[PDB]
Design an enzyme around this catalytic site. Structure first.
Site, PDB file in Angstrom:
ATOM      1  N   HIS A  93      11.189 -33.024 -18.257  1.00  0.00           N
ATOM      2  CA  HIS A  93      12.474 -32.511 -17.829  1.00  0.00           C
ATOM      3  C   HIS A  93      13.207 -31.838 -18.987  1.00  0.00           C
ATOM      4  CE1 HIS A  93      15.897 -32.314 -15.058  1.00  0.00           C
ATOM      5  NE2 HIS A  93      16.625 -32.509 -16.128  1.00  0.00           N
ATOM      6  N   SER A  94      13.584 -30.624 -18.711  1.00  0.00           N
ATOM      7  CA  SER A  94      14.293 -29.821 -19.652  1.00  0.00           C
ATOM      8  C   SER A  94      13.455 -29.652 -20.951  1.00  0.00           C
ATOM      9  CB  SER A  94      15.686 -30.369 -19.782  1.00  0.00           C
ATOM     10  OG  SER A  94      16.544 -29.409 -20.244  1.00  0.00           O
TER      11      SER A  94
END
Lengths: 268, 244
Positions: free
Chosen positions: B98-99
């Site tokens: 994530h990210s």
């Protein structure tokens, strides 16, 4: 030279341990949500001879935005002293009555496996004719389309013959350890439930309006891609078929159960 | 009569976690910048017994607080890759991030390819622009206060000890010097969030050409930290479950 200028980094022995990079995963704090207040209620129907037990653990997998509302049909669980319905229509009407009485006919979806798919379909039709709100979604698994029912006559077979079909279809893997006597307990309810599907004869009617997702199974003789593909015209909303690896009784547990739950979670 | 027709389900017996050594699939999970393995709490029970969830703790945080955090993505990916190989995690594996963690996951897949390792069964990228779109931000150069308010505004805080780690993680993203590389071959699924100003649908759709296998993008509700709770977390886990 033993001075501090001459010192060098050495490999960090702590970092060689598995847990340094990969700590074991951690369980979250264990609701469940109130059916009355949940954003969505997933009303779930069992297969023939099955009970609400089939849906144990669904709530924890699906999370807090949906209330899992399994339906317990007459003849089992706390309703063991009630004669099982043996015809689809009165059963579907009694379920529809129960859903309306207990105010479950808003913000709801329907799920059913095998016989429970047909029941879920019939219940959606009854609710429509009564002018109740339509489901948000209809999920059917392990089931051919309604018009394809009628072929079979399992409920007429002998105790041993019926039991062997159930075993054959993957519904009696337990017997290896629990013995088959266990199963015979279920025979009267199974026969009643089976009669409801087997004496069923789809009368033409308008398609539903709710999105519908149907599940076929690779090892289900009775849920082949095309029997399940046949549900397509039963709705004027979107239709998707998803295909799964298991057999007719995959609901019982395994990769197919997990994937069904996943697919359900994507569309709720 | 509600108890007759509509009995409440009984609580399940929360299952014993699967052995990562023996699980048919190991899902290796990377956090967002300044994040930790706590991001993935509850993932194991939600995903079931067919996948071992393997969160990765990066240097600089938790018990690794005395190690200097990497501030460049390639050596970080190489150190991760060393650890994956050492602990026999380089087969029957998938990657999630994530990210910042999505970029790291991509870099880890590229390092593992160069090293001749088996490819991932799947790459999941969440809340991240594609690799070549990184390197325009300078949040890692902001004051302690401005950086905190950027995170607060993105929905990350609802710290000061963990500022040096956050900064190093952001440095790895924002100094990322993209070089054209051949696409991966593994199936890849990308997630965008409706309220995520950083990783907009177009920026996330831009992952498509990074694989030659199947690519899907799912668009979820929620903000930049949509994995942290609520409806969007549930949907992510469900989409993940459909492919594992």
């Amino acid at each position: 030279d033993l001075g501090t200028e001459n010192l060098y980094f050495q490999s960090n022995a702590l970092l060689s341990q598995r847990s340094a990079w990969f700590p074991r995963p951690v369980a979250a704090p264990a609701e469940p949500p109130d059916p009355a207040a949940a954003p969505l209620r997933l009303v779930c129907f069992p297969y023939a001879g099955g009970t609400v037990s089939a849906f144990r653990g669904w709530q924890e997998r699906l999370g807090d935005e949906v209330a899992v509302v399994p339906v317990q049909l007459p003849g089992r669980g706390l309703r063991l002293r009630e004669r099982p319905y043996d015809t689809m229509e009165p059963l579907a009407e009694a379920v529809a009555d129960a859903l309306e009485e207990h105010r479950l006919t808003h913000d709801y979806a329907l799920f059913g496996h095998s016989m429970g798919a047909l029941l879920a379909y019939e219940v959606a039709c009854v609710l429509r004719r009564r002018g109740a709100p339509r489901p948000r979604h209809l999920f059917v698994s392990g089931s051919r389309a309604p018009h394809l029912y009628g072929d079979r006559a399992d409920h007429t077979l002998s105790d041993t013959a019926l039991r062997e079909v159930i075993r054959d279809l993957g519904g009696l893997d337990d017997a290896d350890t629990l013995g088959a006597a266990y199963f015979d307990r279920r025979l009267p309810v199974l026969r009643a439930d089976l009669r409801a599907c087997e004496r069923y004869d789809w009368h033409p009617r308008p398609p539903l309006d709710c999105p519908t997702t149907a599940f076929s199974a690779a090892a289900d003789p009775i849920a082949t891609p095309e029997m399940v593909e046949a549900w397509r015209p039963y709705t004027t909303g979107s239709f998707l078929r998803r295909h799964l690896p298991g057999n007719h009784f995959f609901l019982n547990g395994g990769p197919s159960r997990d994937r069904l739950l996943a697919h359900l979670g994507t569309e709720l």
